[PDB]
Design an enzyme around this catalytic site. Structure first.
Site, PDB file in Angstrom:
ATOM      1  N   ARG A 110      54.775  28.179 -28.729  1.00  0.00           N
ATOM      2  CA  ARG A 110      54.692  28.739 -27.383  1.00  0.00           C
ATOM      3  C   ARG A 110      53.328  28.482 -26.761  1.00  0.00           C
ATOM      4  O   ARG A 110      53.228  28.227 -25.555  1.00  0.00           O
ATOM      5  CB  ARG A 110      54.992  30.236 -27.420  1.00  0.00           C
ATOM      6  CG  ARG A 110      56.425  30.568 -27.814  1.00  0.00           C
ATOM      7  CD  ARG A 110      56.602  32.053 -28.048  1.00  0.00           C
ATOM      8  NE  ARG A 110      56.022  32.467 -29.323  1.00  0.00           N
ATOM      9  CZ  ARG A 110      55.881  33.734 -29.700  1.00  0.00           C
ATOM     10  NH1 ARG A 110      56.269  34.712 -28.894  1.00  0.00           N
ATOM     11  NH2 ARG A 110      55.347  34.021 -30.879  1.00  0.00           N
ATOM     12  N   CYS A 138      49.974  31.574 -30.229  1.00  0.00           N
ATOM     13  CA  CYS A 138      51.128  32.433 -30.365  1.00  0.00           C
ATOM     14  C   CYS A 138      51.297  32.746 -31.844  1.00  0.00           C
ATOM     15  O   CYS A 138      50.371  33.056 -32.595  1.00  0.00           O
ATOM     16  CB  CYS A 138      52.427  31.821 -29.830  1.00  0.00           C
ATOM     17  SG  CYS A 138      52.717  30.163 -30.340  1.00  0.00           S
TER      18      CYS A 138
HETATM   19  C1  LIG Z   1      56.861  26.402 -37.058  1.00  0.00           C
HETATM   20  N1  LIG Z   1      58.319  26.809 -36.975  1.00  0.00           N
HETATM   21  C2  LIG Z   1      59.149  25.574 -36.609  1.00  0.00           C
HETATM   22  C3  LIG Z   1      58.761  27.301 -38.354  1.00  0.00           C
HETATM   23  C4  LIG Z   1      58.461  27.958 -35.917  1.00  0.00           C
HETATM   24  C5  LIG Z   1      58.266  27.401 -34.510  1.00  0.00           C
HETATM   25  C6  LIG Z   1      58.308  28.432 -33.424  1.00  0.00           C
HETATM   26  C7  LIG Z   1      59.289  28.643 -32.479  1.00  0.00           C
HETATM   27  N2  LIG Z   1      58.947  29.718 -31.651  1.00  0.00           N
HETATM   28  C8  LIG Z   1      57.729  30.179 -32.107  1.00  0.00           C
HETATM   29  N3  LIG Z   1      57.371  29.379 -33.179  1.00  0.00           N
HETATM   30  C9  LIG Z   1      59.940  28.641 -36.063  1.00  0.00           C
HETATM   31  O1  LIG Z   1      60.920  27.971 -35.859  1.00  0.00           O
HETATM   32  O2  LIG Z   1      59.831  29.861 -36.374  1.00  0.00           O
END
Ligand SMILES: C[N+](C)(C)[C@@H](Cc1cnc[nH]1)C(=O)O
Ligand SMILES: [Cl-]
Ligand SMILES: [Cl-]
Ligand SMILES: [Cl-]
Ligand SMILES: [Cl-]
Ligand SMILES: [Cl-]
Ligand SMILES: [Cl-]
Ligand SMILES: [Cl-]
Ligand SMILES: [Cl-]
Ligand SMILES: [Mg+2]
Ligand code: NI
Length: 431
Positions: free
Chosen positions: A391, A386
């Site tokens: 995801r 993703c």
């Molecule tokens: C990797 N982080 C925690 C910064 C991401 C995780 C994430 C959530 N849905 C897609 N990616 C975020 O919160 O944007």
């Protein structure tokens, strides 16, 4: 003569003759965990009648109940057969169907113990259902009670969150400790940390390779207007950490189906104590023990050219066509060329297409059938991905639960792919 409250009983012989009829919908009103295979009444064979769909009676209070039924393609022209652990569990659902234009509704009284108790009656179950635990199972674990699918003596319940301890401090499962997603993933690459870091992080949180880890998170309605919407997608982060821990080498990792919501929906007590962590000195196994679970960009590129492999894009449609990046910290917009699209849901912080409204995993038959329509099948080596791997982890976990033998997460995702300007990318509605 239609009767709103007295429902026709269908016999075992009648139901056997109807198995495989295209005009019959068999509907299992037990919890999704029992449907998946958990033997919640001590039955010898768990799971559902072969071909049955899942419609937990708990969803009768959902104002979108009819839209769920229609989304599952349960039509008024179908003959509807309901069953649960008891026929009495089905009466309210039977009436609800009749209230909404369904005139052919029956109740099967002999699922348990008659159907479950005979080897000749076909049943289905999620192959690795014991990794997706119900709230009743966790309550038994922390209470020292006798529970099935558990032969360990060391466990930890872990509340996952992304830089948001308030998600934990505002209410958590008794005895649980909190794990920030930054403990196992790096903010520079948003990939899993190095083996040496993972070893220290797991030890400092009190986790050894032989410790049964139960992971869950809290859904707090992520809003794209906030700086860190991920701080509210707690249960995706729980499944993200479950992927990293299984990759690292924790032998027994479970995920509470539906996260915190399932714990409160079951009516169990919640705690607000800031539980101190009990560290352990030695993880006790080389990290990573399951390196095949994680795919990096060079292997991912090879998978895009291999007849045996495929990348699976678990992003939203606006991200896929390049309307948005999905994140406030990614400027590049587009998609990886050659990946198979399996739309996650509305945006980067929601997984509607893989979940029910109560955050439990969607009925796995529906996921498997959608996947197969796009060539996403267990005979291939699949790398789900993703934006940053969250995801993709939840999609990967779903395939893992079905027992698929070669499923991985491409950790870098669109974040890593688009950070190299020499990497090709597509945009716009596909042609
Ligand atoms: C990797 N982080 C925690 C910064 C991401 C995780 C994430 C959530 N849905 C897609 N990616 C975020 O919160 O944007
Ligand atoms: Cl059927
Ligand atoms: Cl299992
Ligand atoms: Cl149980
Ligand atoms: Cl925020
Ligand atoms: Cl928040
Ligand atoms: Cl979530
Ligand atoms: Cl993509
Ligand atoms: Cl696998
Ligand atoms: Mg990543
Ligand atoms: Ni390919």
């Amino acid at each position: 003569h239609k009767n709103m409250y007295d429902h026709t009983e269908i016999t075992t012989d009648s139901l056997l003759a109807l198995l495989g009829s295209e005009k019959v919908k068999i509907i299992d009103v037990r919890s999704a965990d029992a449907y998946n295979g958990w033997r919640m009444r001590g039955e010898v064979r768990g799971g559902h009648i072969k071909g049955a769909k899942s419609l937990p009676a708990k969803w009768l209070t959902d104002p979108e109940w009819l839209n769920i039924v229609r989304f599952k393609q349960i039509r008024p022209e179908d003959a509807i057969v309901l069953y649960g652990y008891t026929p009495e569990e089905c009466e309210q659902t039977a009436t609800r169907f009749k209230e909404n234009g369904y005139n052919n509704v029956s109740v099967f009284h002999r699922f348990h113990p008659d159907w479950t108790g005979n080897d000749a009656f076909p049943m289905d179950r999620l192959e690795q259902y014991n990794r997706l635990v119900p709230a009743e199972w966790v309550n038994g674990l922390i209470s020292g009670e006798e529970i099935p699918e558990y032969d360990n003596d060391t466990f930890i319940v872990c509340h996952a969150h992304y830089r948001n301890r308030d998600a934990y401090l505002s209410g958590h499962i008794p005895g649980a400790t909190d794990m920030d997603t930054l403990a196992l993933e790096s903010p520079e690459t948003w990939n899993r940390r190095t083996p040496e870091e993972l070893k220290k992080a797991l030890e400092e949180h009190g986790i050894t390779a032989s410790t049964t880890v139960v992971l869950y998170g809290k859904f707090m309605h992520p809003d794209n207007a906030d700086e860190f919407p991920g701080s509210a997608a707690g249960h995706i982060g729980a499944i993200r950490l479950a992927f990293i821990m299984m990759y690292a080498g924790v032998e027994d990792v479970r995920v509470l189906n539906g996260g915190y919501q399932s714990w409160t929906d079951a009516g169990f007590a919640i705690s607000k104590d800031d539980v101190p962590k009990t560290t352990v000195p030695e993880f006790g196994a080389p990290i990573p023990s399951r390196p095949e679970f994680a795919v990096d960009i060079d292997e991912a590129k090879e998978m895009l050219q291999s007849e045996d492999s495929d990348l699976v894009c678990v992003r939203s449609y606006p991200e896929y066509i390049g309307e948005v990046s999905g994140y406030n910290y990614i400027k590049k917009k587009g998609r990886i060329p050659g990946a198979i699209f399996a739309e996650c849901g509305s945006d980067a912080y929601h997984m509607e297409n893989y979940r029910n409204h109560d955050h439990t995993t969607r009925e796995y038959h529906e996921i498997e059938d959608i996947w197969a329509k796009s060539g996403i099948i267990p005979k291939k080596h699949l790398a789900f991905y993703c934006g940053t791997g969250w995801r993709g982890s939840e999609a990967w976990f779903n395939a893992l639960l079905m027992g698929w033998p070669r499923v991985s997460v491409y950790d870098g995702g669109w974040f890593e792919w688009s950070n190299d300007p020499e990497n090709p990318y597509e945009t716009g509605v596909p042609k």
